[PDB]
Amino acid sequence: DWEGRWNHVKKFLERSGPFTHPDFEPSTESLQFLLDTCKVLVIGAGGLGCELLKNLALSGFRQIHVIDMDTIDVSNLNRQFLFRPKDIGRPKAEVAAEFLNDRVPNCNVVPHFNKIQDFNDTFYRQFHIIVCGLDSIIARRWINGMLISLLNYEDGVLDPSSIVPLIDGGTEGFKGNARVILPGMTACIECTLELYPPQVNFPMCTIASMPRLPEHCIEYVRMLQWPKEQPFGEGVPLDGDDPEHIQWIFQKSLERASQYNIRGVTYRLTQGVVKRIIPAVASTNAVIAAVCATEVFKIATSAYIPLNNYLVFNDVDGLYTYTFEAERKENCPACSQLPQNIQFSPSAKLQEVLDYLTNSASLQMKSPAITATLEGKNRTLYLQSVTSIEERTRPNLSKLKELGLVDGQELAVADVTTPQTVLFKLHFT
Amino acid sequence: HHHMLIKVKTLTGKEIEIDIEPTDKVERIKERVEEKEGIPPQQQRLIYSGKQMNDEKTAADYKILGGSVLHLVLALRGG
Amino acid sequence: LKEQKYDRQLRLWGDHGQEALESAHVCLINATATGTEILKNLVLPGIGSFTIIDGNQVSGEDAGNNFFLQRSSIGKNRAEAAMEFLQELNSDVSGSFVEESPENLLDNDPSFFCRFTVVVATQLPESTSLRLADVLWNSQIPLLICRTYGLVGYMRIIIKEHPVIESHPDNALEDLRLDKPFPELREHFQSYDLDHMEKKDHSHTPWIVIIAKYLAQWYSETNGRIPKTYKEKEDFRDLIRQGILKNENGAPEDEENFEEAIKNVNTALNTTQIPSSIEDIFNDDRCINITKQTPSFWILARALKEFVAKEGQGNLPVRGTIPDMIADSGKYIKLQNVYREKAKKDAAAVGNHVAKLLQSIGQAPESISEKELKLLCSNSAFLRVVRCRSLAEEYGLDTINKDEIISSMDNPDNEIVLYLMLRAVDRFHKQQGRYPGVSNYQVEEDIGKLKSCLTGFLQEYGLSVMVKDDYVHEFCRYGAAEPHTIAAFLGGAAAQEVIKIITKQFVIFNNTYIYSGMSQTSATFQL
Numbered sequence A: 001d002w003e004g005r006w007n008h009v010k011k012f013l014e015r016s017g018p019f020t021h022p023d024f025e026p027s028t029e030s031l032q033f034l035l036d037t038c039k040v041l042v043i044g045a046g047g048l049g050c051e052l053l054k055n056l057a058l059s060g061f062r063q064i065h066v067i068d069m070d071t072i073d074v075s076n077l078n079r080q081f082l083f084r085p086k087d088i089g090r091p092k093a094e095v096a097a098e099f100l101n102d103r104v105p106n107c108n109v110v111p112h113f114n115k116i117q118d119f120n121d122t123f124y125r126q127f128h129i130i131v132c133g134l135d136s137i138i139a140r141r142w143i144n145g146m147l148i149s150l151l152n153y154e155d156g157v158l159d160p161s162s163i164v165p166l167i168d169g170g171t172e173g174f175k176g177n178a179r180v181i182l183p184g185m186t187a188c189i190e191c192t193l194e195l196y197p198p199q200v201n202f203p204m205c206t207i208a209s210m211p212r213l214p215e216h217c218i219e220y221v222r223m224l225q226w227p228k229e230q231p232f233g234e235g236v237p238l239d240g241d242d243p244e245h246i247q248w249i250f251q252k253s254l255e256r257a258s259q260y261n262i263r264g265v266t267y268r269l270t271q272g273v274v275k276r277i278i279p280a281v282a283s284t285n286a287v288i289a290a291v292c293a294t295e296v297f298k299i300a301t302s303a304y305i306p307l308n309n310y311l312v313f314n315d316v317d318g319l320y321t322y323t324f325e326a327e328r329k330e331n332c333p334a335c336s337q338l339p340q341n342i343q344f345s346p347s348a349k350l351q352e353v354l355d356y357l358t359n360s361a362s363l364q365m366k367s368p369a370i371t372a373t374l375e376g377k378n379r380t381l382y383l384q385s386v387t388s389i390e391e392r393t394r395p396n397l398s399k400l401k402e403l404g405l406v407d408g409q410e411l412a413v414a415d416v417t418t419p420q421t422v423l424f425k426l427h428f429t
Numbered sequence B: 001h002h003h004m005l006i007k008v009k010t011l012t013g014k015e016i017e018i019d020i021e022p023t024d025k026v027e028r029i030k031e032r033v034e035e036k037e038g039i040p041p042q043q044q045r046l047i048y049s050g051k052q053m054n055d056e057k058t059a060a061d062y063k064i065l066g067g068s069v070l071h072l073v074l075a076l077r078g079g
Numbered sequence C: 001l002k003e004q005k006y007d008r009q010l011r012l013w014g015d016h017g018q019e020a021l022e023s024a025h026v027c028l029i030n031a032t033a034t035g036t037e038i039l040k041n042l043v044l045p046g047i048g049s050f051t052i053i054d055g056n057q058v059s060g061e062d063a064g065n066n067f068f069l070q071r072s073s074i075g076k077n078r079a080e081a082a083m084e085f086l087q088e089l090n091s092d093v094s095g096s097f098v099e100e101s102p103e104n105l106l107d108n109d110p111s112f113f114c115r116f117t118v119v120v121a122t123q124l125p126e127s128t129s130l131r132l133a134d135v136l137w138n139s140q141i142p143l144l145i146c147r148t149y150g151l152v153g154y155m156r157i158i159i160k161e162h163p164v165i166e167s168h169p170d171n172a173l174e175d176l177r178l179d180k181p182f183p184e185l186r187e188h189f190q191s192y193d194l195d196h197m198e199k200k201d202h203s204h205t206p207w208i209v210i211i212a213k214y215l216a217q218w219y220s221e222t223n224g225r226i227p228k229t230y231k232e233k234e235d236f237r238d239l240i241r242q243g244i245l246k247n248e249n250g251a252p253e254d255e256e257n258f259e260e261a262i263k264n265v266n267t268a269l270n271t272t273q274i275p276s277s278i279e280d281i282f283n284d285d286r287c288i289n290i291t292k293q294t295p296s297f298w299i300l301a302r303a304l305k306e307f308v309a310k311e312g313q314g315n316l317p318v319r320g321t322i323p324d325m326i327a328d329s330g331k332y333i334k335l336q337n338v339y340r341e342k343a344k345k346d347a348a349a350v351g352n353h354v355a356k357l358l359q360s361i362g363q364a365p366e367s368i369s370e371k372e373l374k375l376l377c378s379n380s381a382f383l384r385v386v387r388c389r390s391l392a393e394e395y396g397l398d399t400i401n402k403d404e405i406i407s408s409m410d411n412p413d414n415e416i417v418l419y420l421m422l423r424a425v426d427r428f429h430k431q432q433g434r435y436p437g438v439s440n441y442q443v444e445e446d447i448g449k450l451k452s453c454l455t456g457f458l459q460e461y462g463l464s465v466m467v468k469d470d471y472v473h474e475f476c477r478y479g480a481a482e483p484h485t486i487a488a489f490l491g492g493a494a495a496q497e498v499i500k501i502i503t504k505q506f507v508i509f510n511n512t513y514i515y516s517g518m519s520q521t522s523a524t525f526q527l
């Protein structure tokens, strides 16, 4: 470290001041303590990712990790600034840590070319703070669950040292948001799950044969006409990245559109509709990643009171931000302690339970698996993930009393949205 | 009867006034916003005193009184 | 042609915006952390070219908080160093630098600034700020002053007048005109007979038609006004509810087209209005009084006012778009085209009022294209004009917005306080030749000295607001620091205002933004 290097960080550690967190102790060895020993995990080396990595490195963090499973695409280049075009086809984490470690001296960015699923709790337990700039909802749901599962409750009460602060940024056009989550203390991802906009999807009948919009034509080709005609070889899935596949859908959508008299099918709309593409610029990403970074710094250093929860940002019409404290849900299926309460007739089928699990706007599971202790062994009522078992059990979708379940019994639910076993308590009626 | 004048701040900071009653379901508040501003109710997410306002519950059980300010809010999927 | 590279943003401001962007030239003053973060966010999307004026050497601490300076830069010129790194971001972007300082520039080559689309000055002291803003105001060059000071982030925009057509509103009420239908629409409606329809043909009629049909029946059955109070629109929903065709057994069917119509009674009896925003535009001296100098925007503004008197019976052109509904292809498409064509016809009608003013203006009637006229007709409800007070106005003893400051100080922790502290800090600087509490040696007595400066500032402008002493303490704490993450935030916020100016798309903020890294709260003021 050279003369002056950290002069922009030092004032907030060495000096006291009226607006500090009540735990703040001014010292000339807080900085070195941070650089040396504060382990921080960044999740995603994308738009938000790159910016977080920059922000932490220049903020006095040094023991930084990154996870990203994706590879470098040409379209990343308008914002994912750690990648140059000669890097296309390389793993983001690799390139991102390579860039950072050269640009910011002594930085110890450690790349993990990995899915977040690849890791289990042993791994995540080691970090002091986890910041993520993730892609979608489902993965935010996963990491939320993983950090909650790390929590140790000793007979009803919570060991605070087992909390791993989670900072989540998300971004979409010129709108963006940032969260500070304290698993088991403040509102988690799932507590505020209904905050995401509707993931607009079309009635299969409109796609089937009632299009009114160009998007419907491309969707027709996507889920219907591609399986029907298997044009790039039978048993070859639609690859959204491949320029030939996209070309095929595009022409095949101009046909369908011209038939029903629909102007609007472009190569850009096709590529959008298929990949469900989020419009992205660097400026919005920067804004959000900065907020998150500021908060990581605040939590790790106690230099100020962390953001109490939530911030929304909008750039379209002037500049607007709203900050608030999201209330924790007492009933939350993720972060609350005691099992869910579900009420069914003893002559409810089991399909009925699954339908409840899939559709409930508070549960929103996508491919759940139900398990209960019937007789001696744990018994798998129904599982979806391994087709071996989604066949040995398929019959069971007809009964609950016929299955052997009693009022009061708890069922173990598992789903891809989370590594946790969600517990439901059954009540007959 | 009650004639409560609440305000709603949109995602751009635009503030709008709405006349409601304590019995009015959250559903209807969203319809009042749509009527002035064209924001489809399905896209609306209302926040008052930290609480995410359920369509089916009412104004009363969020303790929303006279000059109260509701805030439309969003959660963004991409990164 | 790799336009795959800009895909994600092309989806926001389009090809026409992207072109505007790729032919702009932006000047940055001071290549500090704030400076290069703003600049990083313009190079990435592919700003045409850039010039960094900066007359400083890279300090030790400069290399500490900047992603675009290195340990090796220490000693070298800040502008030149920053540019070498920023250019590596995007090889479609042309960089430049000038080793002369801002003050030096203004003394020897003020006209230098007439080559830029936008000037973005960062971290300027009070005097330089005031000299620059003045020159550029009279030179009519768009200025953006940005500043990171401790956890406080601040930016002032200054464009005398910035008129925008394509304002990209997140939401708006649809232009359906059911309340005042155009002749070509009434034709399409009467080609629909509800009672005498087939099976599927009933459950596939677009809800707009449906509401129209029943709006006739109501207008008939009331011999007078249409439904206006909430009690009335409820009954109208019920009258619609009747039309749902029952079956053999006796139960109403699940015709969603009718359910949608029932839902949309909320909006689609709008009353077709001229937004009072557009009212203000029409009544503006620059629309009323066409001259030969008048710019392209105000021509078109008048070509709409004149349409409001003549062809429009008192209203704006038809938008020509319709929301998606429940309907079969043909019935939707045919309905879409009745809307589409009327617009394509109201545009061509405005395009005639275009030439009729270009006669008085004495210019060829094809200078404004049919690609420009579409956008203006589409967005006839969405036009905005942002005008900015000059800095001299803000800083004037007899022109300061006391009302705005005092009003906002009601909450003693309102963002405005951070601005007042900035103004205190700035006069601290010019009294002292240095910022407060920079050195640990100086923090103690500077709290004293800074309060005194604040007192004097508030006295000069006759401002009787009270500032918590914790702010004086905290601003000394800062010691003119420029924390990266504060400056990153400004970098994003600012960069996109500059992109707004360049593309003339979206709406610029009006005047003064204040971001507070402490509370993670922000606010806009019109100072």
Ligand SMILES: *NS(=O)(=O)OC[C@@H]1C[C@@H](n2ccc3c(N[C@H]4CCc5ccccc54)ncnc32)C[C@@H]1O
Residues within 6 Å of the ligand: A043, A044, A045, A046, A047, A048, A049, A067, A068, A069, A070, A092, A114, A115, A116, A117, A133, A134, A135, A136, A138, A139, A142, A416, A417, B078, B079
């Ligand atoms: N916003 S961006 O720059 O366009 O993109 C950022 C993403 C983050 C990174 N990414 C996304 C998802 C990742 C996962 N696990 C996901 C895969 C699907 C799934 C299901 C269930 C749980 C988790 C997950 N792991 C690692 N990295 C991920 C790629 C891209 O840069």
Ligand SMILES: [Zn+2]
Residues within 6 Å of the ligand: A187, A188, A189, A190, A191, A192, A328, A329, A332, A333, A334, A335, A336
């Ligand atoms: Zn929760």
